Amino acid sequence: STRKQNYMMNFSRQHGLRHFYNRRRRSLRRYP
């Protein structure tokens, strides 16, 4: 993985974290 790949991976990583909390927050408002 090149630098750009490490960046898009970091980008995906940080977005994955947010992805989790989005589902967590959802579960407290409306699921499914």
Short mmCIF file of C-alpha atoms in Angstrom, two decimals:
data_model
loop_
_atom_site.label_atom_id
_atom_site.label_comp_id
_atom_site.label_asym_id
_atom_site.label_seq_id
_atom_site.Cartn_x
_atom_site.Cartn_y
_atom_site.Cartn_z
CA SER A 1 0.00 0.00 0.00
CA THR A 2 1.37 3.39 -1.06
CA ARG A 3 0.99 6.68 0.83
CA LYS A 4 -2.27 7.51 -0.94
CA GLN A 5 -3.52 4.04 -0.10
CA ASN A 6 -2.62 4.63 3.54
CA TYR A 7 -4.55 7.89 3.38
CA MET A 8 -7.68 6.42 1.80
CA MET A 9 -7.35 3.65 4.37
CA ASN A 10 -7.15 6.25 7.14
CA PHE A 11 -10.08 8.00 5.52
CA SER A 12 -12.04 4.74 5.40
CA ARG A 13 -10.91 3.98 8.96
CA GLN A 14 -12.10 7.31 10.39
CA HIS A 15 -15.32 6.97 8.40
CA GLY A 16 -15.78 3.44 9.64
CA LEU A 17 -15.64 4.68 13.21
CA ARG A 18 -18.33 7.22 12.41
CA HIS A 19 -20.19 4.43 10.63
CA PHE A 20 -20.41 2.53 13.93
CA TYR A 21 -21.67 5.47 15.97
CA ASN A 22 -24.22 6.25 13.25
CA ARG A 23 -25.72 2.80 13.79
CA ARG A 24 -25.40 3.18 17.56
CA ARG A 25 -27.21 6.51 17.48
CA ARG A 26 -29.79 5.05 15.09
CA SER A 27 -30.52 2.21 17.50
CA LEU A 28 -31.45 4.77 20.15
CA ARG A 29 -33.80 6.69 17.86
CA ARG A 30 -35.28 4.21 15.40
CA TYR A 31 -34.42 0.61 14.56
CA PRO A 32 -34.96 -0.94 12.22
#
